[PDB]
């Protein structure tokens with residue numbers, strides 16, 4: 241179609257058609273069926289927790305966790321729980337599945353039975369999910385690998401055809417997306433751009449990232465960046481970057497227009513914003529991330545069921561914050577059971 245983004249030809253189909261190693265293929269069932277199941281195991285635990293809270297006359301600690309509780313209650317009371325009646329599992333069937341689901345079934349086995357403990361404050365959700373780096377592997381899991389691959393693939397296209405590209409990654413964390421990007425853009429550790437600014441809210445990640453990304457360490461710079469705050473005030477050079485990568489982070493901010501405006505301050509006009517985001521809430525994500533305070537960062541501006549936005553919503557937000565909107569959307573899967581995407585947008589001069 242000759243569609244271009246950031247000056248290179250790319251299409252949704254070009255990215256979405258890529259098939260990559262995923263545990264669901266290897267386990268191996270179809271994504272839509274598994275999505276039914278990975279989410280299927282969660283529905284059981286959600287239902288149990290809601291039933292247990294109510295029967296025991298318990299209420300959650302009076303903080304963000306009540307929002308989590310509300311979502312689980314609605315999931316059950318809306319009748320959505322029963323529909324998920326359609327899939328019945330004996331307690332034998334349930335555990336038998338989970339052993340096969342690698343990272344995902346495993347978070348369910350970890351977190352599912354701890355829902356009441358988290359709600360009532362007997363279990364520290366973050367510490368709990370982080371043990372054995374389970375949270376970090378969740379990012380590496382099949383759940384988000386395809387969207388990360390979309391991003392890496394676009395970065396490769398960009399860096400292979402254009403030289404001296406400057407990249408900044410927001411919320412790089414332990415480098416799950418980064419690792420995919422670097423592996424495609426610099427398969428042999430060769431220099432491939434003029435700058436890769438590795439950033440996160442917390443510098444605590446940087447040490448492990450350097451080790452994880454050792455093959456590329458001399459090409460990476462590391463700096464703290466709270467994207468909720470003015471980037472210039474944080475020692476960054478405004479409007480110098482050609483590509484910004486933000487995987488699974490932008491939603492975790494308090495006010496999306498403020499965050500996007502800050503992203504804009506970093507990009508050159510014509511610069512590309514690579515946004516990797518979940519497209520919608522699923523019970524599994526509610527279970528997995530809903531227990532964490534960061535999930536509820538947007539409640540004050542109405543993101544009260546989850547921090548997430550649909551692609552259409554991101555499109556509008558982008559247009560209001562100096563971007564072109566969604567130039568390209570690539571989804572992990574086709575149909576209703578899709579849950580993640582890459583959104584590419586172009587920074588526009590406000591002048």
Ligand SMILES: Nc1ncnc2c1ncn2[C@@H]1O[C@H](CSCC[C@H](N)C(=O)O)[C@@H](O)[C@H]1O
Pocket residue numbers: 379380410411412413414415416417440441442445465466467468486487488489492493
């Ligand atoms: N306000 C903020 N500014 C910059 N980073 C933030 C942030 N709030 C949360 N983050 C970071 O965003 C990351 C989200 S987890 C995503 C990790 C990685 N991008 C991946 O996809 O695999 C965390 O490391 C967290 O520290």
